[PDB]
Amino acid sequence: AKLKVAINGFGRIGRNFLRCWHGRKDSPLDIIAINDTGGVKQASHLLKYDSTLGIFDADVKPSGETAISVDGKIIQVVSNRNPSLLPWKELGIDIVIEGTGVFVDREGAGKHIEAGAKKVIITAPGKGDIPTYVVGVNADAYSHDEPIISNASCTTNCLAPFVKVLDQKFGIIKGTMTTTHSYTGDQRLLDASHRDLRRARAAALNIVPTSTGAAKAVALVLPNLKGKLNGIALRVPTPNVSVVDLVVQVSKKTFAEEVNAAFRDSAEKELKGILDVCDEPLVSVDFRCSDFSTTIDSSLTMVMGDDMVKVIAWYDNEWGYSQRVVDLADIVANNWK
Amino acid sequence: AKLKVAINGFGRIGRNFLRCWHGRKDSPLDIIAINDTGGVKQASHLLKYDSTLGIFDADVKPSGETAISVDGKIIQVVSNRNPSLLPWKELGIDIVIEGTGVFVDREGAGKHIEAGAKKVIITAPGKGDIPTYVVGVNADAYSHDEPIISNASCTTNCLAPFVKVLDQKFGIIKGTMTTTHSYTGDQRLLDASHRDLRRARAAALNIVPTSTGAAKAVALVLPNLKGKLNGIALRVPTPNVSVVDLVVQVSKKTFAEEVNAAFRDSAEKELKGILDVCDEPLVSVDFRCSDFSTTIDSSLTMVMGDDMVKVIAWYDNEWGYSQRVVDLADIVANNWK
Amino acid sequence: KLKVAINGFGRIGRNFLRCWHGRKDSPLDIIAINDTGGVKQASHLLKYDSTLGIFDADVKPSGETAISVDGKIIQVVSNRNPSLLPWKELGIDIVIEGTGVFVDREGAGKHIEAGAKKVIITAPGKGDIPTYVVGVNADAYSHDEPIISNASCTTNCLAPFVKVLDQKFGIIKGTMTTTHSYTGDQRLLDASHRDLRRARAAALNIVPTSTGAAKAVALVLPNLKGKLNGIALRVPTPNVSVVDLVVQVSKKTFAEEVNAAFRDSAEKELKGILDVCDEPLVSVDFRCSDFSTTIDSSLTMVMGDDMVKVIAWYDNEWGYSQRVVDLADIVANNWK
Amino acid sequence: AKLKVAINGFGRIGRNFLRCWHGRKDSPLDIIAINDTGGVKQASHLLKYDSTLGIFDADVKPSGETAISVDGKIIQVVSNRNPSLLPWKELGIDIVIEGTGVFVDREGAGKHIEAGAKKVIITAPGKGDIPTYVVGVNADAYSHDEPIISNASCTTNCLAPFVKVLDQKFGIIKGTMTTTHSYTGDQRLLDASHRDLRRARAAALNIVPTSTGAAKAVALVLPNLKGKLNGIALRVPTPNVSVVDLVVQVSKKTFAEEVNAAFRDSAEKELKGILDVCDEPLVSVDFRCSDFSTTIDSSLTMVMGDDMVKVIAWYDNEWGYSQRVVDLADIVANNWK
Ligand SMILES: NC(=O)c1ccc[n+]([C@@H]2O[C@H](COP(=O)([O-])OP(=O)(O)OC[C@H]3O[C@@H](n4cnc5c(N)ncnc54)[C@H](O)[C@@H]3O)[C@@H](O)[C@H]2O)c1
Ligand SMILES: NC(=O)c1ccc[n+]([C@@H]2O[C@H](COP(=O)([O-])OP(=O)(O)OC[C@H]3O[C@@H](n4cnc5c(N)ncnc54)[C@H](O)[C@@H]3O)[C@@H](O)[C@H]2O)c1
């Protein structure tokens, strides 16, 4: 029997998750329900038409007053803001993909379990006693008896992979980081109220600085990096695809070329499929739909004074993350005891 | 400087309104209250820094604990979602500029009167039987009796002025209209749930067609055009300033240079300070902060088959419309029995 | 089997080669590219496209004077002068002239005046010059024509359904405005330009720009001379445009009648050319469409029984390029 | 006195320079000639209308078919792409503002001298060993017998001022830098021909990596920094205003607060008018028209491990740089032997 999956929050990560899964090969999962404040009208139209991804090459037509049909498969489209009131027990849901961005805390994520679901995966950094995992970095450490887990944030998944390599092979004493990130739906379209007075500013018109937890989050999946990193973010006028700029003071003297090699190795061995060295003089858009969590721009790699390293890595924050979420969902399935 | 004003909803229109007023000489109005759910802190910032208007050149310091000082003017910042509860009777408020876009009908805007306010000017099309005006067109018909009134939409403020001219000097049989408009708060930064599947699409990435009653609305301020006009709107990737494309069939044969000559007459006469004719080959950004609700782009004026006329008009949907809310508010102020 | 040479490896040039590469069995064999920017920049720019996406194939350079696209090998020359182009030495029949410069006989000629026996200007042509819009009057093409124009992306969207309208309601007169994505002609930031409007920052403004498009329709549909006209409105999108046609017909009519008319033609004389969309979509949705003109059904309006307003979507780069790869097919076919 | 000035390359810097100068009071300069490839047509129109600066608050209009008048002051408008053929000897041109970005070496700039002008100020880095200066950092070292000088790049002018403070106050051992920069006229609107395959990609749709010689140009005006810094650039979809993300390893151990304090200190003394510290949460737009070459974003300053400092400074590449160009021209005109 295949694991039954419910998607809470059919937004950007929610919809990228389905389209990722769809393109999967022998998914140990079966998306059978969606939930979101909108009904079939939105859930359907928005899954078929995407300004970022494009039109979904699949049949996406409503399927009755409460469901959509994707290539013959029917998916229940429920619509209740209160997770405690979802047909999870009634639909026999195994894994819930929490993509609302408003149930990332344990008491909130647990509501899904109270409602029937046996497990919940927060598509964002979690709050509370929530184990955090990053595929290719430490998801191997997951345990079947853990009901609620976090897949972290899109920046930690780009950072973690190559921080692992850098630390292991050179020993990261300390470092700082900056992610020039594509704007998200959290910022405003035009100057408007927001708890953060910077995110309140017209998103597509500005370079908007904002904090990030990635630098400190890395320490959750890479214990050794605890207290060593630190960083910020610069939201820029692009709809998707971002880049993280890391500078670390390594313990072992090295050079740009030696560093890029280390990555290419990793790309072939342990981080096979998660990391990827690019040697082409490309640009942001060239990475739309990149299945890699982190792609080093090898030619940008710098080494100042023998031990100060600069590394720029690309990532598609919507797609790349979503794929990762799927990989973690598959991991949670394969450990299903 | 005489009548006490309170601004409900300190969004784009509200703040534009405040700056417009702040710039008038010898004013009937005195702004003493801003209701904003975001608090003094947020109001002070978004008023001072504007991604569209630039830094407001005035000393904007907070005043006391619940007010702000604009060039020495103390303005109270209250904060309640329910208009019925605002300290209007307490502050002595005469006119309320409804700028939330969620209290457009009588019961809605009516709450301000319950609250102690004497009159309400809805900065948007009203719902049901609500007096509607357009300065330069029918604002003189305002009766000091009417407690709640409408200043129509920004597009309706661009048409009426020159449709008044076309229908008068050429008789309008019928026409159609398409307004290439800048995006606005009602659109989504990225594809996301919205009642209008067109508006749910990433604003700064597409050309979004959307309906608009502006066409029909002209029939309220210019009775003669009832049922004669109709149109749509195409939202485009610009933060501010819009253009109206009008095509009317007149009854009196004519040519381009005459139509334009006509518009220039209204400019120096019955439509001074409202209608304007531009002869230089400009672009949208050149019309930022234009005090004219409508500016004809003469070199674009075309006449096909002696009586099918096309007129292209420019307008700052934010600024210009606000200059009009102030004008209507001034009319209300100088007709206070 | 009919040696083709792409002159000007720009948006169209490169969009052209990709559309063609996609054709299941073309009578066209592209043997040479000629741009003012070396082979490397040629292979690279072809492989990665901000608007099209990564070109799914194998675009690796084959030597310092040619590239190997998905097996085949295309020579890549580089000369600012057509006269100096190795057309005879390569045996070119038709040179797709997509540089934007040589758009008249004296200019486009140098190509034929150096080898090629036929040129297809990917834009309007100066004065007396054979113009063709596939699906409207491409049949009138006689092999006698040494040079021909495939019109502009807008005329190819306007001509199709403007025909359907006249043939079914008869256009008395008409006006037209095109909300168009900016293009290479425009400056990135305010900088000198012949056209004071095209000098303004493309991505920051709604830029009014004049166009032939409307009058052009007259050329492909003689029955419209002296009736249509209109301006263009450049907007902050890098691709896809929309034409807003307003015509006064003689035959009293209404919205759904007009649409019904479009839907028929859609699956008859205009299948693959015109299409009717009944979905509340947006510009980006129409990226890579193969129809010169896609009517946005729900936007069709009719005032006073005989004033019709129709909105049609078209990918100004791909859609147009597809027709160029067709007006080439037309040519190849009627080869005497 | 009052040296006669000529502007070569009426581009962004050329036009911003004129407006910067125009706004000065008591200027030792008098701009009396403009050379570009457009003539009075473009010249008048583009000086008046600016999608970035807005409408120039001056009476701009052509004077004859070979000059223009700005507030009555008439300025010649020549048009020859070959400096050698410029009317410098007859116009009595003293100093030339070279902003074509194509005559940036001695053989190039020299052509202006060969044509009559006494001095040349390259509004960009010079090729070879042209005397480079950065106002506030070393422009005082300028010598009257140096015919051709360079005002360095815009990034260098931003970075130089606060690098001067950091090294002076904490001692810079080594550092790396990343400038998220607005796109300029050197990038292409849509994917087109360019020697650089990154800058070839549509500018307003990507984050574009691109080299920068700023990091090492700093060593030119602050010798102690030679060999110690490297860096990269990332062009983003904004029309104007940039930010440099600087990370350095210092000798003296410090903390975020100590660093900012030093900037404010310098800000009020040695770098007065050149450096500023911003304490409010602003975005890129809020910095348009800043006369400072470098404005620190105090709240972003971080220190990791006692001595790895990360500083962020904003700057209007166009307007800011131009203000410094006027300053360098003043400096040149005040040591006129
Ligand atoms: N876009 C990215 O780059 C990205 C990447 C990684 C992780 N994330 C994380 O994913 C989460 C969602 O991000 P997003 O970009 O998709 O945002 P989004 O706005 O597109 O999606 C949120 C969705 O949840 C729905 N929703 C809100 N409250 C709800 C409720 N009570 N019940 C049901 N549905 C509700 C909304 O209608 C919407 O469809 C956040 O935690 C975010 O931090 C985002
Ligand atoms: N943007 C334009 O060009 C424009 C032009 C003319 C008319 N209008 C109309 O003006 C209105 C506002 O438009 P806007 O663009 O300024 O939008 P906006 O989103 O910037 O402003 C709406 C404001 O009202 C506040 N608000 C919402 N509910 C409230 C409540 N119950 N109590 C108090 N404040 C509340 C919001 O938080 C916000 O500050 C709409 O009716 C709109 O149609 C807009």
Ligand SMILES: NC(=O)c1ccc[n+]([C@@H]2O[C@H](COP(=O)([O-])OP(=O)(O)OC[C@H]3O[C@@H](n4cnc5c(N)ncnc54)[C@H](O)[C@@H]3O)[C@@H](O)[C@H]2O)c1
């Ligand atoms: N982009 C569109 O949507 C579009 C649509 C339809 C028709 N067109 C027409 O196509 C033409 C080109 O448009 P584009 O968008 O591809 O522009 P573009 O600037 O990208 O392409 C022009 C190309 O020609 C090259 N070129 C210029 N002069 C040359 C010379 N002397 N020799 C060789 N190569 C030379 C350039 O380096 C470039 O590769 C124009 O005539 C335009 O009207 C464009």
Ligand SMILES: NC(=O)c1ccc[n+]([C@@H]2O[C@H](COP(=O)([O-])OP(=O)(O)OC[C@H]3O[C@@H](n4cnc5c(N)ncnc54)[C@H](O)[C@@H]3O)[C@@H](O)[C@H]2O)c1
């Ligand atoms: N915009 C910035 O951020 C910036 C900042 C600092 C320094 N700079 C430097 O300033 C220079 C100009 O940059 P810009 O952005 O103002 O460029 P730009 O494209 O806006 O202007 C360059 C101008 O020079 C003219 N020109 C080119 N060749 C010419 C010739 N032979 N004769 C006469 N005029 C000629 C062009 O027509 C144009 O008006 C470049 O060297 C650039 O590196 C630019």
